[PDB]
Design a protein around this ligand. Structure first.
Ligand SMILES: Nc1ncnc2c1ncn2[C@@H]1O[C@H](COP(=O)(O)OP(=O)(O)OP(=O)(O)O)[C@@H](O)[C@H]1O
Ligand SMILES: Nc1ncnc2c1ncn2[C@@H]1O[C@H](COP(=O)(O)OP(=O)(O)OP(=O)(O)O)[C@@H](O)[C@H]1O
Ligand SMILES: [Mg+2]
Ligand SMILES: [Mg+2]
Lengths: 291, 259, 638, 630
């Protein structure tokens, strides 16, 4: 009630501040305590701060002229919380997979995806700057927060799945793994982006871009969109029977993937391109006008 | 004048090197892993280079023994020359393994500092303060010495408490002067009030009496809770800031009775 | 004895190493100080050419260029500034604690608008933090081209013109250390200069190997990058506020922070006192996701000295509750220490803060006029307001005026407490309000029934932070605040009806007694209040402290389960509605048989539901539901 | 020729003004620097006397005397060191960035136990931050007594002193500036002493004009002694207790203490202390994090526990005294903060070891845990790398326990041979969760649950996904798995069909109040109960998160878990309802009952009640019906 102007040291009533009575001008200790209500014993309103301050106002009624007491007819909030202010925050468990389960039918707002895309790629630039190796990064290792922020976690099998995990982390359809994974080579910027490139298409479709069985068969689905050449555009690190993959044309990503704006179709096609050296870096894609 | 020795410290959990789109809960774990893998690779390499060096060393050492033997051999000097060249190559190989080891030494010099390279566990000694042996002292015998010297030692400080009025100042005061939370203090305050009455200092007497019952209040529920008053005096100011008008006045009534 | 006089000496051999090694912790200042020196030299020209245009006959363009050379592991700073003479290289550049900017400080009596940045005469030597060797090739118009050269080894040299065309300013050759190659990276260069040369008057460009398509043109892209962009953001507060429009000011905000949307509310602050400074305040159109992540370091209000980023200690620059206003504070009168990383005499910032806060409050007041955008502002940062109200004692006289609430008379319209007060009745001497878990809860609370029947307006409050603010704010515009949830809710009413209530109290006197006994150790006081209309009874809070909404808040939010406070701070009172059919019946039933356990059980039921209806938790909800199930079974014939 | 060579120069006139204006920020540190220099000189004596004891003939006492003089507004500092020769006064004292401490340290290269500081060579000039003029009077054992006078005006003078003799050492006269008289205050002096001189090896005394107003020798000014410098094996519990009490000013001694030192490129000694009780301001956001203080050579540098230790460990008191850190020219700041992070890591490891050993001491651990389990749980929440270690320290009450807490590993040791998960229940109170319907069948199936009654447990359990290979499961969520006898399974499927249309009816009645209506054997004594979907907040988490004043309400759109109505087909009520559905599924009274039961279950299940008033109004109506009112 009183108009606060200054501050008294910290003690029983915490940070006791100092006010003046809006009407009489009398000074007062702006004492404060946290305020709950009931407990395990039922409701309430456990003894009584609800009249403790009445004591303090009773002391004011006595005017006993040495009664520093709590301001106004309530246990005023003058820096409350015991007294002691403390914060605690919740971890976000909103898995990208959950996002997609909560997401709408094929044609997921390209602009939303653009924002999440550039967040992802920006995250990658950091990860590439820190040489973070994680060819095993899959949709479920991507966190999408309630504020619409992409966060990356679980950087490769070396430090993940320390507790109960999948029995087919690799056997499962690897439609989200780069050809370089399917070729049994290694991790690279293009590998990472190939993975998420399909994920981005999944986001647009709310449904995996490709879906094969074996690594070669998975490529057999991949090739249907990006196109296929014979054994003359294959990398050295190839475990798959390169050259035994009958050549075929590409299928305009723009038309295949729902709401895939041509600029993003180009970025995706570049991310999906079989040859890792014909792909686009996270930085280049990040800085592309599409995003 | 030169602290460059600490310009290359690597910290795997460095929270000042993070990113908005990265979950560092696992990134830091990745960094740990990378550090370990790199050390394993480094150590492997060094050992293999050392091995190779020692092998070529032994090979040329034995060849040199053989060179002496071929020199001695009656016509073995033709073979000697052949072996000399081979021994030279073995020495050159040894050398190149050592040159690689020198490069490993250079790599060690370039190595980042961390909890495994900066230092070792020079000394560690734990201790849990269990005890000091279930016992008990006669508080009257303690008082006989304490009341007489403690009160005089802290007489002014006891009086300073008696001169307080704000509930918060009383808490902080005893928080700073925890050794004053006892009966000897309260007893002085009672005696002091009597002396103040005699000296016609009733205004002060009344305030001292207020603080007298504050110390008595601390003693009151400390006994009820079966705990050392100094361990819970802060809960009396917590109780005071929380207890009902009717019941805190009732606690003040019980308090006045306790005194 | 004989008094001998000695001059103080200096062990330069040690001193030099201390300058390099012990003066700085952050090697990023390398480029900052180098650029600063270049801009000082450019300022020197500006003055000289200002008073004498022929001073530009050997070059008019004023700028700072940075060219990295990875193939050498060196950096080149191109200073198109006035440069130095041979004597200056020897005297100024080659002397510790020596600066020619002081000469300009004294010489420029006419050049009052020429502000040199810094003046210690030692920052140059910080170059050797990351450089093995530095060569400064320069040609001041009053001398020839010379190549100053040193590795900071206790000596330096000066060489004659080597033919590398420098007719103005200087070429600083920075030979980087083996382990300082990160400063050859575009990214790294940009990271540093963006934090230190942000508002340099003269444009800074980088000459970088341009990432490009293979030169097979078939395709080909440009070979080099001209990164002028580094200084695309100019000082705004330096111009006249009246001549600054949003077409540029809003753009500044968007460049101030990565936000592709103009600001919500802004305030230019011009200080012409001892602490001369100018500042721009920016309020976002929405709160940030991490707004309350106080674990993070603040950086909204930044402190610049002579347009150079020095500090961003918002902890000192602004209040915690104002940690949403982004902006720039720029002063040329600040006493920075030798490192220029920290302002000496923090009391300066204490004054600066107070002054800024005053303008924040004025901005908020200005916003209050624009109800549309005010409501947008208010809702975006209502918690921050309430936090200021909660924490900032002194300025609540302005912050409480910014409060806006939904009431029983305004309904869905959020209104000012001043509007509330101006519309108070002649009997309405106190502001009535109610807090709770939600609008529809308090809007249907038993506590506001009579209050509405008495024609009083009830302010509806729902946030936990509101629950703080109601404890704090208990008077506004001369009239106190009374929660309708509290006991002693003295509504203005007809004395004769009070008499009727006293007669009702006599009527239900024995009932209240019986109920208290039934609810012994459950409720402190069972009594009667006409605040209730449709309800037979209601657990009511006391005039002070803990209230219906409060447990939810503090018991669950506080990490410290201060069980003393948890067990020392709440009673319980039960109001009775003497006009309610059940209450009437209960009286009759008590009179019929006060020992009728069934009636007693009914009282307990009603008690528990009184707790529920008032937003209180039960000691064992399962037994409550068990009673319910029992009653259901009775209804079902089970 | 084409190049000229020059030595680097220094403009001392400006340099000096920089020294006493820009090199320092705080000014009270002038005592630290001058006292430090005294202790360096006192160590010089000690060493020299080790080789030649007759050097102690000119006084055998090593100390620092502080004598304020308000009548002049000056401060006399008497340093009983060796002293400075005339040459030293003009060479070392009168030279910037130069100290003979190093020369002495060069003498000490022959082998010594001597430890001095002073690698910058400028500390002396900090005196002029506060003093207008400084006079240094000294008498070296190998020279005469000389007065050295300067106001830092670019020059200084030296003359042989007269009058009072100095056996050895030097006296510093601080002609304090008119606005620096605050340093004549006892409190102010002691403040600085306690700030940076609390562990100076030599006696520092403060003379005060007190009863008869004469200079009283405050010998106890720095009576506090270093303990980590002593051999830990020779330090008793009483000594560790006294140190803790002196360190923290807590009358109560510590719960536990641990000495810790590292050697190598990083080198330090330290004492860590666990307090027996938590502080009333433990979680205060504005509390200075200075529980453990940082020293170099027993000289206070800083106490920034914000980086030194984890926030969840911000209760451990102690001292870390390093041997050699990269202090800035301003010693108050340390270069290369990554060093502190390394130190932190080493400390954390040792704290965890101490905690483990404390856990071995069950009785004191229980005491510890009761006081600092909150911090432990915060560690579970915050620290992703030591969580596993911290989880071993967790203790909860469980079904098979009394009021005695038990570890998760102990729970695991009592798990059934077919039990693949840890059953638990969260809530506001032990009694609340003890009476929950969710643990009734669990008990009927012979299972133990973990009782979690603290709000933080929602954050803790969020991270406790698996323990010792065992998964964890809440009894309050959907999908609660308990042993399913194939016979019973068949019977349950029969029951599902039996109450199929009943559940459909209930859903039609409460279509927008419940996501799914179904029977479940998780219930025993209750007719029905509301469960939480595995996705989103629990009823408890909802209630708790709603408490947060600073919570963003829009995040609930991602956290509002689905509610489902569990039905217990074994009750007469449920059976009656089935029969009533058959009699007339459109019976309004039955429908009202269904709604009643739902709200009854929801409320008693710990879920937020939409409208307590309307709920109670229904009750009042039913009461009126029982009373015959209307
Ligand atoms: N690029 C440059 N062009 C012209 N003069 C320079 C340059 N770099 C250094 N100097 C010389 O150094 C002097 C001061 O530089 P220095 O930075 O060392 O001191 P300062 O800039 O005055 O303040 P600070 O020492 O804090 O930077 C200038 O007056 C000038 O003589
Ligand atoms: N009590 C003393 N007795 C003898 N000599 C002293 C005393 N105090 C200071 N000196 C002399 O003062 C000179 C100046 O050194 P100064 O203390 O300024 O550097 P430092 O303090 O040793 O280094 P730092 O700046 O790191 O503290 C030293 O050479 C030292 O011999
Ligand atoms: Mg400069
Ligand atoms: Mg010294």
């Amino acid at each position: 009630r009183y108009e606060p102007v200054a501050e008294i040291g910290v003690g029983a009533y915490g940070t006791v501040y100092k006010a003046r009575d809006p009407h009489s001008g009398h000074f007062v200790a702006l004492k404060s305590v946290r305020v709950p209500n009931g407990g395990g014993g039922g409701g309430g309103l456990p003894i009584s701060t609800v009249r403790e301050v009445a004591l303090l106002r009773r002391l004011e009624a006595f005017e006993h002229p040495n009664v520093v007491r709590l301001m106004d007819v309530c246990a005023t909030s003058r820096t409350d919380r015991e007294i002691k202010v403390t914060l605690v925050f919740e971890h976000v468990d909103q898995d990208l997979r959950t996002y997609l389960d909560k997401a709408p039918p094929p044609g997921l707002p390209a602009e939303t995806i653009k924002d999440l895309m550039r967040q992802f790629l920006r995250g990658l630039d950091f990860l590439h700057a820190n040489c973070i190796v994680h060819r095993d990064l899959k949709p479920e290792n991507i966190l999408v927060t309630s504020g619409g922020t992409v966060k990356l976690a679980d950087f490769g099998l070396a430090r993940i799945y320390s507790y109960q995990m999948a029995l087919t982390p690799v056997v499962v359809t690897l439609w989200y793994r780069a050809p370089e994974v399917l070729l049994q080579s290694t991790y690279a910027t293009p590998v990472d982006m190939w993975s998420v490139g399909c994920i981005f298409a999944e986001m647009f479709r709310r449904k995996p871009l490709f879906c094969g069985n074996s690594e070669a068969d998975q490529l057999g689905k991949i090739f249907d969109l990006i196109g296929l050449p014979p054994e003359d555009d294959w990398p050295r690190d190839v475990s798959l029977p390169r050259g035994a993959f009958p050549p075929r044309g590409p299928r305009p990503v723009q038309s295949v993937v729902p709401e895939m704006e041509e600029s993003g179709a180009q970025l995706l096609l570049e991310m999906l391109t079989f040859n890792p050296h014909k792909r686009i870096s996270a930085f280049r894609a990040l800085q592309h006008s599409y995003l | 004048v030169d602290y460059s020795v600490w310009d290359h410290i690597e910290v795997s959990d460095d929270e000042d090197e993070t990113h908005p789109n990265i979950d560092t809960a696992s990134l830091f774990r990745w960094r740990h892993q990378a550090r370990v893998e790199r050390m394993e690779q480094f150590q492997k390499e060094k050992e293999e280079l050392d091995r190779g060096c020692r092998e070529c060393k032994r090979k040329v050492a034995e060849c040199q023994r053989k060179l002496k033997e071929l020199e001695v051999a009656e016509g073995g000097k033709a073979e000697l020359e052949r072996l000399q060249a081979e021994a030279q190559q073995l020495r050159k190989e040894e050398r190149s393994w050592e040159q690689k080891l020198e490069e490993m030494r250079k790599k060690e010099k370039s190595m980042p500092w961390n909890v495994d390279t900066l230092s070792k566990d020079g000394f560690s000694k734990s201790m849990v303060n269990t005890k000091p042996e279930k016992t008990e002292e006669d508080s009257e015998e303690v008082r006989e010495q304490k009341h007489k010297t403690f009160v005089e030692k802290y007489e002014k400080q006891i009086k300073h408490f008696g001169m307080l009025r704000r509930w918060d100042d009383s808490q902080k005061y005893l928080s700073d002067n925890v050794h004053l939370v006892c009966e000897e203090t309260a007893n002085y305050l009672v005696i002091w009030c009597i002396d103040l009455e005699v000296e016609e200092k009733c205004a002060l007497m009344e305030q001292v009496a207020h603080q007298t019952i504050v110390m008595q209040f601390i003693l009151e529920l400390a006994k009820s809770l079966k705990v050392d008053p100094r361990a819970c005096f802060r809960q009396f100011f917590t109780k005071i800031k929380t207890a009902d008008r009717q019941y805190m006045e009732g606690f003040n009534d019980e308090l006045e009775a306790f005194k | 004895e004989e008094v001998e006089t000695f001059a103080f000496q200096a062990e330069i051999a040690q001193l030099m190493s201390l300058i390099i090694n012990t003066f700085y912790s952050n090697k990023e200042i390398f480029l900052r100080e180098l650029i600063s020196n270049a801009s000082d030299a450019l300022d020197k020209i500006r003055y000289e050419s200002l008073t004498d245009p022929s001073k530009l006959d050997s070059g008019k363009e004023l700028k700072i260029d940075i060219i990295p050379n990875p193939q050498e592991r060196t950096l080149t700073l191109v200073d198109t500034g006035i440069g130095m003479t041979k004597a200056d290289l020897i005297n100024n550049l080659g002397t510790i604690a020596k600066s020619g900017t002081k000469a300009f400080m004294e010489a420029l009596q006419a050049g009052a608008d020429i502000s040199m940045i810094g003046q210690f005469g030692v920052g140059f030597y910080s170059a050797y933090l990351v450089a093995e060797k530095v060569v400064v090739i320069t040609k001041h118009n009053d001398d020839e081209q010379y190549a100053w050269e040193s590795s900071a080894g206790g000596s330096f040299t000066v060489r004659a013109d080597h033919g590398e065309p420098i007719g103005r300013g200087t070429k600083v050759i920075l030979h980087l250390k083996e382990d300082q190659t990160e400063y050859l990276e575009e990214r790294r260069v940009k990271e540093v200069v963006k934090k230190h040369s942000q508002f340099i008057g003269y444009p800074i460009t980088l000459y970088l190997e341009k990432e490009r398509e293979k030169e097979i043109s078939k395709k080909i892209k440009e070979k080099y990058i001209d990164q002028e962009e580094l200084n695309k953001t100019k000082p705004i507060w330096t111009r006249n506020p009246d001549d600054i429009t949003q077409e540029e000011y809003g753009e500044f905000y968007k460049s101030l922070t990565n936000d592709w949307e103009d600001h919500l509310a802004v305030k230019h602050f011009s200080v012409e006192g001892q602490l001369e400074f100018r500042a721009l305040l920016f309020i976002p159109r929405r709160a940030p996701f991490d707004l309350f992540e106080n674990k993070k370091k603040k950086n909204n209000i930044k402190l610049y000295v002579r347009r150079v980023f020095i500090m961003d200690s918002c902890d000192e620059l602004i209040p915690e509750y104002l940690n949403f206003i982004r902006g720039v504070v720029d002063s040329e009168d600040l006493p920075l220490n030798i490192s220029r990383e920290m302002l000496q005499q923090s009391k300066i910032l204490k004054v600066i803060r107070k002054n800024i806060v005053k303008k924040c409050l004025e901005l908020f007041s200005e916003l209050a006029e624009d109800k549309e955008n005010y409501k947008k502002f208010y809702e975006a940062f209502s918690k921050n307001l309430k936090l200021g109200i909660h924490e900032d004692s002194t300025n609540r006289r302005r912050l409480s005026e910014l409060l806006r609430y939904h009431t029983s008379q305004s309904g869905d319209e959020m209104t000012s407490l001043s509007e509330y007060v101006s519309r108070m009745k002649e009997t309405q001497k106190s502001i009535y309000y109610i807090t709770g878990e939600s609008k529809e809860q308090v809007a249907n609370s038993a506590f506001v029934e009579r209050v509405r029947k008495r024609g009083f307006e009830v302010v509806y409050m729902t946030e936990p932070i509101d629950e703080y603010c109601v404890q704090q704010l208990k008077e506004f515009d001369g009239k106190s605040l009374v929660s309708v949830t509290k006991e002693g809710l003295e509504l203005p009413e007809d004395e004769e009806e009070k008499k009727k209530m006293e007669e009702s109290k006599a009527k239900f006197e024995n009932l209240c007694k019986l109920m208290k006994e039934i609810l012994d150790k459950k409720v402190e006081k069972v009594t009667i209040s006409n605040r209730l209309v449709s309800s037979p009874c209601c657990i009511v809070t006391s005039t002070y402290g803990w209230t219906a909404n409060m447990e939810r808040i503090m018991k669950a939010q506080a990490l410290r389960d201060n069980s003393t406070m948890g067990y020392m701070m709440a009673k319980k009172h039960l109001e009775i509605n003497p006009d309610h059919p059940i209450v009437e019946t209960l009286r009759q039933k008590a009179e019929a048989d006060k020992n009728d356990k069934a009636v007693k059980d009914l009282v307990v039921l009603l008690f528990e539901t009184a707790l529920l209806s008032s937003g209180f938790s039960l000691e064992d909800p399962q037994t409550h539901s068990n009673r319910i199930y029992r009653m259901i079974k009775l209804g079902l014939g089970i």
